[PDB]
């Protein structure tokens, strides 16, 4: 666009300076030239202004790319959807002609099952809460499992902690919590 503007002839008799100078006696040529200078100077100013604005767009992108490099390649980000959909594990950069390409490796949950749950287990009047897991049931037995992957464990005193009584908890269920030392102590 910038180059083509040179042929515009911005109100002048000709877009070509040599034709203006050849055809005219000079006093008029200066006027015809001023018209071309004004238009051509305006064209450069237009070009540069747009380049400054576009440069800002790229700068912002580069700052984002640099941020991603630091947080997704040189570490493991916990920012949701910052480094791909799913739970971020790692990423690998690849170069590109005028930019960077990130390959984001994420963990995505699949094949969920529906379990019955509860906030706590009532054992001998004590409210047992899970440690780093959730209480689930298959309709019969209750188990405790890590929230993000079904891997049911027996509910024991090593998988829970005790706070208060069982009257305060809204949806507590009755069950037995196993003490691993019971068969060794008695």
């Amino acid at each position: 666009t910038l180059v083509k503007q040179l042929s515009s002839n911005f109100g002048a008799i000709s877009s070509v300076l040599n034709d203006i100078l050849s055809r005219l006696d000079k006093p008029e040529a200066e006027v015809q030239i001023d018209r071309l200078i004004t238009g051509r100077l305006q064209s450069l100013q237009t070009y540069v202004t747009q380049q400054l604005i576009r440069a800002a767009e790229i700068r912002a992108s580069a700052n984002l790319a640099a941020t991603k490099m630091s947080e997704c390649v040189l570490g493991q980000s916990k920012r949701v959807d910052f480094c791909g959909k799913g739970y971020h594990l790692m990423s690998f950069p690849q170069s590109a002609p005028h930019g960077v390409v990130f390959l984001h490796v994420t963990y995505v949950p699949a094949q969920e099952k529906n379990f019955t749950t509860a906030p706590a287990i009532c054992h001998d009047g004590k409210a047992h809460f899970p440690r780093e897991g959730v209480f689930v049931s298959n309709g019969t037995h209750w188990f405790v499992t890590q929230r993000n992957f079904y891997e049911p464990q027996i509910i024991t005193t090593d998988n829970t902690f005790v706070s208060g009584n069982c009257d305060v908890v809204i949806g507590i269920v009755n069950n037995t919590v196993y003490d691993p030392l019971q068969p060794e102590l008695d």
């Binding site: 450069l44 930019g99 490796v105 994420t106 949950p109 699949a110 969920e112």
Partner: protein, 129 residues
């Protein structure tokens, strides 16, 4: 755009015909067949209206777009869903980092080799700088 279907008489007037005329908030749409079936956004028109080519006998249709499949979570006070498996997904994210670096000799652009022109460009002070 912004034109009522009452206007646009039946350069060219080939596509000013009737039958296939649909009034949208975006303007008068001619040549597309409006349907009551929603679909994903294809060619956006505006105000929820999109168009697509349906091969339905290989013709352009207009519709109100769907925002995605409907779903309902089986929520209860005692039901939890837990994944038993997982997949490792790899996605690609593309970001631009830099532009082509250019510079322009303002005198060469404006005046070139014309001395009679470069002597007038001096009257514009520092603009070139």
């Amino acid at each position: 755009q912004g034109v009522n279907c009452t206007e646009v008489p039946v350069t060219w007037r080939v596509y000013s015909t009737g039958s296939n005329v649909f009034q949208t908030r975006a303007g008068c749409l001619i040549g597309a067949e409006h349907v009551n079936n929603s679909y994903e956004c294809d060619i956006p028109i505006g105000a929820g209206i999109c168009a697509s080519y349906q091969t339905a006998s290989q013709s352009i249709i207009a519709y109100t777009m769907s925002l995605g499949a409907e779903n309902s979570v089986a929520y209860s006070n005692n039901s939890i869903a837990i994944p038993t498996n997982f997949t490792i997904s790899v996605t690609t994210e593309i970001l631009p980092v830099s532009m082509t670096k250019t510079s322009v000799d303002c005198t060469m652009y404006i005046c070139g080799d014309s001395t009679e022109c470069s002597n007038l460009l001096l009257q514009y002070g520092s603009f070139c700088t």
